[PDB]
């Protein structure tokens, strides 16, 4: 509720060429027996969200898994941009979600 300065950029994060990723892969995650596998470049892999890791990177990914109606594992990759803030902290905005599901033909 002010003419206060914005906290961070909104549009997108492209400070620099190329892209470095925080790959946030929970301990609960198991590797599916799928042909589709995640392929992330210049990635820092972490099991726990970490500020130093976000500080170093431009992009953020969270691997999230649930059991779906038909007893099959459903893998979601939640992706977003990392922004630095006036406070010297970090913000992640989720941009899109990749869902990978399996099913038998019937």
């Amino acid at each position: 509720d002010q003419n206060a300065p914005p906290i961070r950029l909104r549009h997108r994060r492209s400070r620099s060429a190329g892209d470095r990723w925080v790959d946030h892969k929970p301990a609960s995650n198991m590797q599916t027996e799928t042909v589709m596998q995640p392929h992330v470049p210049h990635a820092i892999t972490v099991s726990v969200a970490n500020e130093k890791a976000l500080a170093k990177c431009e992009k953020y990914m969270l691997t999230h898994q649930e059991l779906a109606s038909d007893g099959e594992i459903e893998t979601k990759l939640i992706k977003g941009d990392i922004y630095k803030t006036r406070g010297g902290g970090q913000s992640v905005q989720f941009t899109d979600i990749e869902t990978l599901k399996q099913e038998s033909p019937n």
């Binding site: 509720d1 099991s47 500020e51 969270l62």
Partner: protein, 162 residues
């Protein structure tokens, strides 16, 4: 010392307002958080690492991926929003029952106390089913995020009880 804080609550409870009031001493315009924020806030020689994760319903299933290593839970409640107070109770209890959140002390921000007819700290306590819980360390802190009232009182409580 250093303390890791996870801050949850339904959408529009005022979590981001709190985070930036505490870090920037500014009442800033917020957008609903589709993602999460991190600020380190230093008060009374404690370095608080605060994770503010968006509360919109399609984000709550993701909350659990931020449980690990949390030393303090801050749960923020809109005290003017009676319709969704029970919903908040459900979410709160869903959080604190997780194995990963077993050791975390619990701070409630009964937020938006400035708003007309706001539910009081003691009413919040009853309606979040806190009164029955005894095996966990909890505290209801009245607060107004836009003015800053109660915020630092809340951080004091976490300091004392950790």
């Amino acid at each position: 010392m250093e303390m890791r804080i996870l801050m949850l609550g339904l959408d529009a409870a005022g979590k981001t307002t709190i985070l930036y009031k505490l870090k920037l001493g500014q009442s800033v315009t917020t957008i609903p958080t589709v993602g999460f924020n991190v600020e380190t806030v230093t008060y009374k020689n404690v370095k608080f690492n605060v994770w503010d994760v968006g509360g919109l319903d399609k984000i709550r299933p993701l909350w659990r991926h931020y449980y690990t290593g949390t030393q303090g839970l801050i749960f923020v409640v809109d005290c003017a929003d009676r319709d969704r107070i029970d919903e908040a109770r459900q979410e709160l209890h869903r959080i604190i029952n997780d194995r990963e959140m077993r050791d975390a002390i619990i701070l409630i921000f009964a937020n938006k106390q400035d708003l007309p007819d706001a539910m009081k700290p003691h009413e919040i306590q009853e309606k979040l089913g806190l009164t029955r819980i005894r095996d966990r360390n909890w505290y209801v802190q009245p607060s107004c995020a836009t003015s800053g009232d109660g915020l630092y009182e809340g951080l004091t409580w976490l300091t004392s009880n950790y």
